[PDB]
Amino acid sequence: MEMEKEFEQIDKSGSWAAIYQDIRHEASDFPSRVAKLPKNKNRNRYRDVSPFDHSRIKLHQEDNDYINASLIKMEEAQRSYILTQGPLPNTVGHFWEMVWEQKSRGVVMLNRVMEKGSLKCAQYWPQKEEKEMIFEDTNLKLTLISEDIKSYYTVRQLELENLTTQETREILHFHYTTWPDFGVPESPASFLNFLFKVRESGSLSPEHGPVVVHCSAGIGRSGTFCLADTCLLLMDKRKDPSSVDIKKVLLEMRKFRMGLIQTADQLRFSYLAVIEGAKFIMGD
């Protein structure tokens, strides 16, 4: 069923809460035993948001390999993503260790450091060229190279140096700065423009490791980003674009991380973004 007609149908009958609860009922439940070990309590932001064991990213260290991060591998679309929580004061070094070890080119941030008067993640990148950051627990150096501030997003060029080997790499930081404190955006236009800027940079392409994407918990806004991207790619690849089923794609992604899409409003917004984005995919 053409999702656009599915959309109007749900909207007129006002059944978004019902659709969304069906997804919650059918979603996968896999163990998350490592996340719940006592030694990892200060590595998790939220008690009820944990990576599954089978898909968690492991840090390359013998001490403690745990980070709250998951590999979402989309086989038909040929895209992979790492979804993670916003870094905590005690996990900023782990976060950049993961970026290094997984060979990522881009980091996608969908939250502000402060929202609703409370801290939603650490200030984990440098704000001035001449004031670099050193992460002593993981032996990395991070320098701000340049910053481009636009009305709806900011893009930063960063240098990450492995101090053990003196190798350096360029990382791109894509920061969507205008998601509202409550609810979802009224129009998907600026979010889609942002997605296309990330695509154009190469950060989603198979010559690099998976993009790292986060918000505060790494499931709501972060789930909207990867769901929209994958659905649009499938519409490009298939003979019949109307065959793409957003609810089925979301359930496939929920095999790899729990809780993706946190509200019925985020589900509706994801439909809207794919419907409006398709009016470029199909050739306009």
Side-chain angles (χ1 to χ4, degrees):
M1 181 179 185
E2 161 66 337
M3 57 191 316
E4 178 140 32
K5 319 295 169 45
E6 212 211 308
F7 180 92
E8 299 275 2
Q9 198 207 173
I10 300 159
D11 231 17
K12 92 182 185 308
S13 46
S15 48
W16 282 110
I19 302 305
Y20 179 65
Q21 199 62 39
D22 286 11
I23 289 163
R24 291 193 47 171
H25 180 271
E26 289 293 308
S28 300
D29 188 28
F30 295 111
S32 46
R33 278 161 218 140
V34 181
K36 288 278 119 183
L37 294 175
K39 63 168 172 162
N40 291 323
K41 160 202 236 185
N42 82 335
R43 292 183 181 213
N44 295 312
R45 183 174 288 285
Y46 300 107
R47 283 336 91 170
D48 54 331
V49 180
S50 301
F52 298 140
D53 296 319
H54 79 89
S55 54
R56 77 185 180 92
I57 301 290
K58 299 178 184 179
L59 306 173
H60 301 175
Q61 45 165 123
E62 40 208 74
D63 184 42
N64 182 345
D65 70 8
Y66 178 74
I67 182 170
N68 193 317
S70 308
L71 178 66
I72 288 50
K73 280 200 253 233
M74 298 309 282
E75 182 195 5
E76 186 189 356
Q78 285 294 293
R79 277 274 219 260
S80 298
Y81 318 83
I82 293 167
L83 268 61
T84 195
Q85 70 185 14
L88 291 156
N90 290 295
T91 71
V92 177
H94 307 149
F95 177 89
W96 288 113
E97 177 187 1
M98 171 169 78
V99 168
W100 182 268
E101 288 166 357
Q102 301 301 314
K103 300 184 160 52
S104 310
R105 175 73 190 318
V107 171
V108 171
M109 184 169 170
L110 302 172
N111 66 286
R112 293 166 297 282
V113 165
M114 180 160 286
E115 298 182 7
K116 295 178 184 182
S118 296
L119 295 174
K120 301 288 163 194
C121 80
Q123 181 63 50
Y124 66 87
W125 72 93
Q127 303 187 274
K128 290 176 162 134
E129 285 88 340
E130 70 275 12
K131 295 278 217 183
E132 74 274 12
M133 293 177 84
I134 295 208
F135 303 101
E136 281 186 16
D137 57 340
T138 54
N139 210 43
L140 291 158
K141 181 174 73 173
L142 184 66
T143 309
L144 176 69
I145 299 303
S146 74
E147 195 167 35
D148 199 344
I149 302 174
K150 302 269 164 43
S151 53
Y152 285 93
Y153 74 97
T154 296
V155 181
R156 311 183 173 90
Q157 294 183 126
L158 307 173
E159 198 211 47
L160 188 62
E161 185 183 343
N162 184 334
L163 290 173
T164 302
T165 69
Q166 307 189 130
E167 304 164 70
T168 61
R169 285 177 205 158
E170 180 169 273
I171 308 300
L172 300 177
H173 193 242
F174 287 92
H175 187 182
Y176 187 80
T177 54
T178 54
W179 196 294
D181 263 18
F182 293 96
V184 308
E186 184 167 284
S187 156
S190 62
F191 191 68
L192 287 167
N193 188 69
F194 176 74
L195 169 60
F196 298 154
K197 295 286 145 133
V198 181
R199 281 184 173 195
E200 278 169 19
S201 81
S203 292
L204 286 166
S205 299
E207 63 248 39
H208 301 292
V211 69
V212 172
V213 351
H214 78 89
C215 45
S216 193
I219 61 175
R221 306 174 190 174
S222 290
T224 302
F225 183 88
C226 66
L227 183 60
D229 183 53
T230 283
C231 284
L232 289 169
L233 219 45
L234 291 169
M235 282 170 95
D236 254 351
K237 204 159 145 123
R238 285 182 183 178
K239 277 196 206 165
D240 185 3
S242 64
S243 81
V244 173
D245 184 339
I246 182 170
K247 304 188 290 254
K248 282 176 181 144
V249 177
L250 177 54
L251 286 164
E252 179 67 26
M253 288 176 169
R254 278 198 178 207
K255 298 178 182 176
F256 299 93
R257 189 169 175 83
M258 67 168 67
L260 302 182
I261 307 297
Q262 276 184 294
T263 70
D265 227 353
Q266 282 176 6
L267 183 64
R268 181 179 187 274
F269 179 76
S270 295
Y271 273 76
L272 216 52
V274 174
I275 292 161
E276 294 302 316
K279 314 176 187 291
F280 166 76
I281 293 332
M282 188 72 259
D284 194 345

